[PDB]
Design a protein around this nucleic acid. Sequence first.
RNA 1: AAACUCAGUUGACACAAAAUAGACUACGAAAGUGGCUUUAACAUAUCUGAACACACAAUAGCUAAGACCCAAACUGGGAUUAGAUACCCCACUAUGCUUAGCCCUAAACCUCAACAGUUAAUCAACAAAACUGCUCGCCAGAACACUACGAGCCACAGCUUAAAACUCAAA
Lengths: 96, 128, 99, 48, 86, 137, 122, 107
Amino acid sequence: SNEDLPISMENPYKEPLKKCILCGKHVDYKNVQLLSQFVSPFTGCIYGRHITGLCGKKQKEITKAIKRAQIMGFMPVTYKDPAYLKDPKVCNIRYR
Amino acid sequence: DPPPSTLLKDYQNVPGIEKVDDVVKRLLSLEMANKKEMLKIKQEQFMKKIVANPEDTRSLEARIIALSVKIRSYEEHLEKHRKDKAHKRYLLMSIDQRKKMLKNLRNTNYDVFEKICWGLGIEYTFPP
Amino acid sequence: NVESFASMLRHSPLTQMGPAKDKLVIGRIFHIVENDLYIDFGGKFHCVCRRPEVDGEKYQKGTRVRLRLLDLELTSRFLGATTDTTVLEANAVLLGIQE
Amino acid sequence: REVLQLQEEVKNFITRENLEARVEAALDSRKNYNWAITREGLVVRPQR
Amino acid sequence: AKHLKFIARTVMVQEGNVESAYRTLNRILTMDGLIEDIKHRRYYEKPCRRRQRESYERCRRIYNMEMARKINFLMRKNRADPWQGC
Amino acid sequence: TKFSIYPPIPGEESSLRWAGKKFEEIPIAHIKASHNNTQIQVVSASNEPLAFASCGTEGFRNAKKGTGIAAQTAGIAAAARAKQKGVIHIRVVVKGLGPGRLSAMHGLIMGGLEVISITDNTPIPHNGCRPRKARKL
Amino acid sequence: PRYELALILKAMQRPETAATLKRTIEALMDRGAIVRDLENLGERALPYRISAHSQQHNRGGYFLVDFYAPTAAVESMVEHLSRDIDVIRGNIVKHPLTQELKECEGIVPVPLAEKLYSTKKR
Amino acid sequence: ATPSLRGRLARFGNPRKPVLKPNKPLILANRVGERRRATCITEMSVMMACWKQNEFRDDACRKEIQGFLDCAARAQEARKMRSIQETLLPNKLNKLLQRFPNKPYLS
RNA sequence: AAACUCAGUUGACACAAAAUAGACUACGAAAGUGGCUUUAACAUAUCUGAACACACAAUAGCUAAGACCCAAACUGGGAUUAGAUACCCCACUAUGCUUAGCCCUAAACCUCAACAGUUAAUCAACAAAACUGCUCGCCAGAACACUACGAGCCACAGCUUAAAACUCAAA
Ligand code: FES
Ligand SMILES: [Mg+2]
Ligand SMILES: [Mg+2]
Ligand SMILES: [Mg+2]
Ligand SMILES: [Mg+2]
Ligand SMILES: [Mg+2]
Ligand SMILES: [Mg+2]
Ligand SMILES: [Mg+2]
Ligand SMILES: [Mg+2]
């Protein structure tokens, strides 16, 4: 009938759905190095998702892993292990 | 309860499963599986023993068999957790639902209803 | 053989352009107020950029410049609003002058 | 395939026979489960 | 108690400006929520009051974030009136 | 090396020194800024008591104790005692959000002692015990 | 099912460590487990002091025992670990590798909630 | 990113119990809140301690007294400069919001 | 003021409670549930369906046996006040905790019933937009009255069901 009329399709220009840094990666309570990347260096508090930039599922995984490691003796509770203070910062917190 | 040596429902039909190590067989047996797998084995046994089409699950007979296995699981659970009010409620609700299913089956297909009652040991008592 | 609205829309440069994000367009300063340059770039709206500190005098009415578009229109919905609030102007970055 | 892979793995399972050997091998070796993540989501395995 | 000392909540003073060190430590505690937590734990906040306060704070944060978004969105339109007079 | 707000880690080989001593060997000036009283005890690296000073012990009484001025007085007295007992640099550890929290450090410095680290050890239970009921005035 | 026993043992020499590991694996096998693998995570300073069997511990040797055991054996193994005196702290968990990584396409956003209030002028 | 408001309030079509119970409607107002409102006590303390140990004879406390006086003058100057500096402002922001008001109704 | 001569550091140490995550909004029928691990486990392939039964039902409370850090009705002391049987401070008990039974009430409220559907021609006001179909429950001026009587119940100063008379033109 008419070829210039718009066609029914999806959005070919759709930008990729942003993926959390941990998407597709296995959060384990033994990976204390990864877990310490989401705990405050000074108080040991677990950062919120507004700081970690994690999806809900990965935030819950991180929290459960941190608690399990802390109670199983893999991770300090009140502070970040000093061995990991110099790891790639991935948290949107600026104390100074 | 099926013997602990029984295989899981998914592996009972894999070819050559009789030519694997005793360790592999024990890994795939009900001994190294939770109670849900044992309940599934019970359910398949009952379906084979009663229903005319063991491969059909949407039928009311299959529904009654599955619900009876669930009721047995709840009764076993409450034998040990006597103060589990949530599972007591689930058990009573499941008994009521099985009564309703049996009522419908009795009204529709009586011979199948008798077969179900005999197989599952259910006595269909009329409501007061 | 008269072009229809469908044909015109299909073959228009704006339609040929995809999303207006990070697209280099040629704007034309049509109004200047202090260091604010109102630039029209063929969209429905204009972009109000700031006279670059370098070559500032070179930016005068009618000057044709290069913009990197970020949004044809600056609109967004806010808590409780039933319809988008629009500031009636595009978003673009002034990359310099076209010669 | 699951059972096939399981049969392969069962050969390596610790048993009452190869128990001292496996215990000593474990004492000798060291498994490291740590690995950091960068802002770009690239694993950073530690250097040992 | 069972942890190592002088690692948690410890800041090092630079060039002797203990005031700057204490400001940094206070910022750390406030951002981590320890100051507010201590103030609230001084007296027992009954669960219903705690829930009401949490809900009120959540609503306040939503409203403030939305208002800040609106302000930042409209801030560009604080330019000089281009069509003055007409 | 560049200045880092994080304290040096025990066991780790560090070049930082104060009066020829490592961080783990510096004396510790425990401050306790209660709601209405500031206490200050300076102990050695091996928890050997050296000095003590409190707003109450400084002659302040009743509400006067819970003020910044009383905290400064206590800090100055503790600093003087520690100085005469052989203390130059101190790691300050304060547990309490009372009015004397910072004034105690100010006095502890004005009395001579230099501070190298400020530690907050305010006991923050992860719930645990139940605090007293709220006040209706 | 598949369990993983994270086992922090008292810091001791190699002969005693091997004896303790052999005893623990023996207890698992007696209870009916299939010890699939043993992994040494390396001796390290515990994150916090642990007081097990009236003895304070600041360092310990970390191990993982990946096994398959019947569900009824976990409680007995936990009791045996508690009785054992060379174990600073033992914990049996479900093996993480059994759990499957559900695919996440991306972080789908939540648009601003709409029509929470009537459109009447107030 | 603002916290989600989907399924938070008690509404029809919301099976779950409310997450939030806002006393006022969560609708942006066309205005923002108004700007909500000792100094140099250490020099005073120094001067007063010197007075206490000297019997309040300013002759030998001159330095501390001059410091205290200069600090008070600086405090007044700081008050003046802060006032003039204070004088985005809530008034201007309210003008902007009036220009772009929130429309919680239809038209 | 009264109170204690107990207070600071360090080390050992719960049958109590469960920072941060949580700016998540999930699970459960509701009450409820936010430390860790494991086991068991989250009824119904059609919906509605209890004053007509079965099973639950926070806190408080009763009975008996234990625990007791802290909190804490009552009580005692200090202070305030015209008084202060309160508010404020201190001490401490029942009680909060575990076990086995009871008790069966909440502003048990999201005051918005279950199921299915619609967004079209709006809609007293406010609140959380307006409705359609179907089903059960409930309501018919206020107060008397979460009352009396009767009945049932492990309840004995109780709970559930629940009136009438007199009164008023209002509520
Ligand atoms: S972004 Fe993919 S799981 Fe979070
Ligand atoms: Mg029904
Ligand atoms: Mg009912
Ligand atoms: Mg009850
Ligand atoms: Mg008691
Ligand atoms: Mg409620
Ligand atoms: Mg009542
Ligand atoms: Mg009655
Ligand atoms: Mg009666």
